[PDB]
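agent: user wants the full assembly modeled, not chains individually. Plan: 1) parse entity lines 2) check alphabet per entity 3) run joint structure prediction 4) return tokens. Steps 1-2 passed, two entities, 1031 residues total. Proceeding.
--- entities ---
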Amino acid sequence: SEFCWLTGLLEKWRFNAPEGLERLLWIYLLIQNQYLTLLVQRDDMTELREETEKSYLSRFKHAHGAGVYSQVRYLEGRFAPKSDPNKMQKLLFSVLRGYWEYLSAHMSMEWVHEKPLTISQVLDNLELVEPHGKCVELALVPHFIKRKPKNGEAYPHALLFKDLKNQAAILMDMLKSEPRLTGWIRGVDAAANEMHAPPELFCPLFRVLAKSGIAHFTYHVGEDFPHLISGIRSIDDALRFLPLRNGDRLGHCTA
Amino acid sequence: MERFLLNSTVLLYRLSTVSLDEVSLDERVESSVFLAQYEQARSLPDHVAKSAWSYLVQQIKQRNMKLGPVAILRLIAEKFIKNEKGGPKIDLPMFSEWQTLMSRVSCLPIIACHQVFNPGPASQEYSFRWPLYPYHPTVEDYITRECLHETHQHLNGSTSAEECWLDALKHPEACLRDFEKGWASQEMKQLCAQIDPSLTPRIFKDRLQIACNIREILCRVAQGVELPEWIASMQNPQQLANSTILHNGREYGFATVWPIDDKYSQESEFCWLTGLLEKWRFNAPEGLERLLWIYLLIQNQYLTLLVQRDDMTELREETEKSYLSRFKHAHGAGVYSQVRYLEGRFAPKSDPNKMQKLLFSVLRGYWEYLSAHMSMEWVHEKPLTISQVLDNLELVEPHGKCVELALVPHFIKRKPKNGEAYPHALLFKDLKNQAAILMDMLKSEPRLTGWIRGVDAAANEMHAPPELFCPLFRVLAKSGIAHFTYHVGEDFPHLISGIRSIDDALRFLPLRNGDRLGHCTAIGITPSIWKRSLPLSLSMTKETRLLDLVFIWRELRSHPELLRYASDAAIEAVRLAHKVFSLEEEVSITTLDQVFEMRGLLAESEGLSLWLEEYERARELVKTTGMKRPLKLYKQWLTSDNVRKQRAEYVEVALEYLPDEAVVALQQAVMAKMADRNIAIECPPTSNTRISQYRNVSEHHIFRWMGLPGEAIEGDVPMSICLGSDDPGIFAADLKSEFYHLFVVLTRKFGLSPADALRKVAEVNENGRIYRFHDV
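--- prediction returned ---
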């Protein structure tokens, strides 16, 4: 609708345009551009429920691109963990159902449940898909969000650690409640900022998560270091303390 | 010291003959470890072994454990096995030592101990069927992208030694009869005496019975049921050698009920040990702990005996099941097979009915593997015959997600019997007979040519020269075999002899473009390494010496730096030929060369159906030219008793008869011929240490073939090298294990990048696809 409207308006203004309406189009473009700049700079409930699984389905179609064959094969999806177990179950159900919708749209094959409506039936449908490389292969890596260190509270990062421990708790009890989710929940990330939480904060979190079958860990090194030596030390600390096994990754090693 | 505790004839003897009432055997076990260490590894210093034992005892004491199989298995499991994304894996630095340990100790108790004490994450379901591997993302990514290719897979026997041990427990009588049949030969007597001087078939029966009885008793312990109280009469381990215990005048059996219907399966073996170790997590009874120790020692000694021996009713016990398990093992875990092109080698049978059953079982097992993994329409659900199996198999298309099977029977050379006209007469008749059944079957089922893709000859090099199989291979070529590989037995009396053997195979055998040669160590090992631990002078037959002399002259008669060696070889070869042939005329080195050029001709043709056409073809080609004096000399070479007596006579040849530069020049000359003819080499697994001159894996000649700096010699001609896992020399092995072993050595000892190391190993691996025998 956005493209068709503008193409029609520009077609009717091919040779001349009224001055007032021409300025109206100018104002609309300026407002849209300023909002887009505000959004991108800010990036680095009801609104989420407005799209829900539709946004994820559009994401997988966008990753697939035009043509019968997907231009992207291996896609690792990052989502913000939620402290509410019910919200978490809805979140992963929407993402997985959208992935099944993308696969069903591109691949025509027998499905156990035409309308799964739950995680277990979604995994029942998804386990029939074989790795063939013509579609998008999805891996889910939730990214823990570090926060500001509150004053006092024994050790400097106490409330933040409790919040991260809680978020890990819902992730763990779900994984034991559905063992097949270990084939889709493939990693754990921590991408908020480096000053707010040091890499050594997530070491107990990552080691305990490793015993839950996560099997992969990536850590974002926030590149707002006060000094270049500080950032280099931050990357070294991540290698030294975090349980990064063979094949793991580190995020944004600009230092 | 752990390998000595889990594998020692002295320790097993001192544990199986001493009553279970004794509880303090630390001193005597320590003495057993030192004796086993000195016997197995004498080069290790005494003080180093004592310090290692002291650390091991202290390590057990600090862990609040007791000296026994449980503590040793725990220490090994932590030392080698850790949990990763793919489950239990082996540390990349520790994989080389793990392979060395696998040559002496079975891994199944170790992985069971690891599962008990270091379980996988989230208690996820885990099954142990394949041997453990290390993990590297580059290697796994390459394997998933480009599947591994096997060029030498012996379909006979089992996948590994461990289920062979369970097969021995399953059929003690069948293995006993096979053991006694081999034991009649003197070679088996020497081999058994080397492993254990006090080893007899009676003792073999006793140890097998004791191990089975220990398994039953510990099965009751592991299952949780109370012991049936006859253990009071059980005081001496030797009471388990008769399968019945006399308690209060009653004959009590040992067998019990097992949860799994297959009590001798791998899963039953793993489950039993995991349960037993779980119930012994904190403490174990001393008598039963020693019983587990005795079982492990008996199993390990049997596995060592089997692997050293490797390099009817028992065959019918498994039949198609063994082949089906082989293809599943090659496929590995996951929906996609880790091996794409697999060339299966089987021993030909002189009985046509036995041959038809053999290939029917192999092909039916392959169809079972394909049907299990691929769901599609089948012409016959139960083929029960070769023709219907091929009807089902022809519907399968080459897609790369499953194992592609090629069948290459390997003819077995035998000892040359005395007399009988030409030296190898009865052996040639036996090989001709075996080829006859193969040929008449191929004409009886033309579709079999798409599965019977090659012919091999792998017994030994001394017993039969390469020129023996030349008429066999040429006639087999006209039958549609289309591929030929020849195993060069690397037990050459001299390095020059082995180089000559490879040259003779290239010269005489009809190896066309894309063919392969098996185990070309002679042109791979450098003279410096080969001379290790060798006498200053070597012994070989006059026939072998004369052939080497002519070969040296042919290759080196132009080398300006080596005209000493070629002229000396030619002169003393002529002088040797005078002794061997007892002739009185003058023979030049050129005449000797001509006589040895016609070695490939058939003996009957030299004296003068597809077989007859080859007969006059060789006969006429010896008469087109106007020379019969070399032909007459070859007749005397073949059918003169005095010449044969001279040929079998041994001469004394110095170790450094030729300098290392001259020997390297001979190796590079054969290298050029090998590359020009485009003949690949099936490299043995590097974990197989029968060379005895390689004191570490990094000294293997495959790295010289790979062109590694320091390993490759100047002037070496690059060759095509394939990966063949025929006799790995270790209990649990796979083509994946060899791939990882080469990658580990390249990355660590040679300091190569993971991408660079992967590139070199990939080139060797893909040579098995370029030079594959499978129909295109």
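agent: reporting back. Residues 167 and 744 of chain B are 33 Å apart (CA to CA). The longest strand of chain B covers residues 148-154.
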